[model samples]
Target: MTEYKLVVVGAGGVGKSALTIQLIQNHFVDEYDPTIEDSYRKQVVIDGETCLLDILDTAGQEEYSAMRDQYMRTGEGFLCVFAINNTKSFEDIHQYREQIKRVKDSDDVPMVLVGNKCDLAARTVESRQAQDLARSYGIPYIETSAKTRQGVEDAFYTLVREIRQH
Candidate 1:
């Protein structure tokens, strides 16, 4: 079976764990506790091919920044997420991308720019702006709401597709 290591990263409270948990377990989590790191493995079929997906849910704290390089080095693909309601989180995504590129030593790494928390009413980052940023990095952009489970599957499936193509 094919195997892929995927990492979900973003600022604290952006719903990185929530997103991954919802995708793998089909449930929603309403609380936020800072994570150092967590790993999950599952079998999924994408495009009629069965594969083992190894997902890493990473902490978004500044103190954990040093460990990001390790995660980037091991991950085959990344979901660079941000909360639409938090502009600072959205702004910090570029740093994560750059770190990934630096650690992986490849500019064409498979990644998706995810604007999470789409179900909330207070969105600071506009969809068009997020799309533009994704375009600048030559990556796909998606919006997800962990609470409502919107676009959660597409975000993971799209990254898997990108990894396959790469």
Candidate 2:
């Protein structure tokens, strides 16, 4: 199996861990101080092949250790996530994008811009604006809801595709 490590990144409370957990277990883990930092792996079939999906659900564990960049350095692909209802979360994606580029020591790292929490009523970040930012980075943008489990797999698979394509 082709193994790819995907990192979920965003500000606190942006569904980073929720999206990562939903993919492997298919159950939403309520983000109420339930031990946020972790890593997940799943044997998934994508494009007629069994692929290993590796997800790191830590935003800034770099301070915890030197190995984890300490997390971004090991990330093969990244899901730069943001919440749709929270405009501040959406704005922080730019920072996540830049840090990944720098830490990876390459300009063209495999990444997907993820807009999570689509189940919420309010959308502070427009679809057009989000797409434009993804376009600027030459990456795909996917909207997802961790609770409903919509577009969760697509967001992860898209990263795998980007890795293969790159």
Candidate 3:
């Protein structure tokens, strides 16, 4: 079976876990109870295309080093996520990229930059700024809202499609 391993990375409270759950199960958790203690894996079929998604929903704490190492070593794709409402989270994308290089050593893997929480543009950090950053990294970027199911599936589908074409 063709499989894809993806890592959702970002600072704490950036909705990485929420995005993963919404994409995998097609529903968002209202009161999020993080299972950072363990990883989640599932398979979903969209338009006859089956995807085996291994998602490492790690904590955004400093202790993520060990979990991040494992993810970088095994992930075939990455979703560098940040909340649209937090500039610091957006700025931290650099750190995420550096860590990916430290362990993965390749940028060829399909990657997607997620500016989550598009439903609340009033609180957006800097939409254009984030887009420019993602462009600089040569990865596709999209605004997502797991709460409203906006771009939830497309964010994952677009990256998977790009990977398949390559």
Tens-place lDDT digits, model 3, residues 14-130: 888888888777788878575463467778775588777677676777776786788678877778888888888888878888888778777566788999888885665777888
> Could you give candidate 2's per-residue lDDT for residues 19-69 as a string of tens digits?
887888889987574324688888889999897888888743334434435
Stronger candidate by TM-score (1 vs 3): 1
Per-residue lDDT for 125 in model 1?
96
Model 1 segments beyond 4 Å from truth?
none
Residue 92, candidate 1: alpha-carbon lDDT: 92
In terms of TM-score, the best-performing candidate is 1
**How do the candidates rank by lDDT, highest first?**
1, 2, 3
Native-referenced Cα lDDT, model 3: 0.78
lDDT of 1 by residue, 1-166 (tens): 9988999998899999999999999899987578999999999998999999899999999898778778879999999999999999998998888888999999999999999999999989999999999999999999999989999989999999999899
RMSD of 2: 2.0
> How does model 2 score by TM-score?
0.91
Model 3 TM-score on a 0 to 1 scale? 0.89
Q: Pick out the ten consecutive residues of candidate 1 with the lowest summed lDDT.
A: 64-73
- Model 2 has a clash total of 1
- Local distance difference test, each candidate: 0.93, 0.84, 0.78
RMSD of each: 0.8, 2.0, 1.9
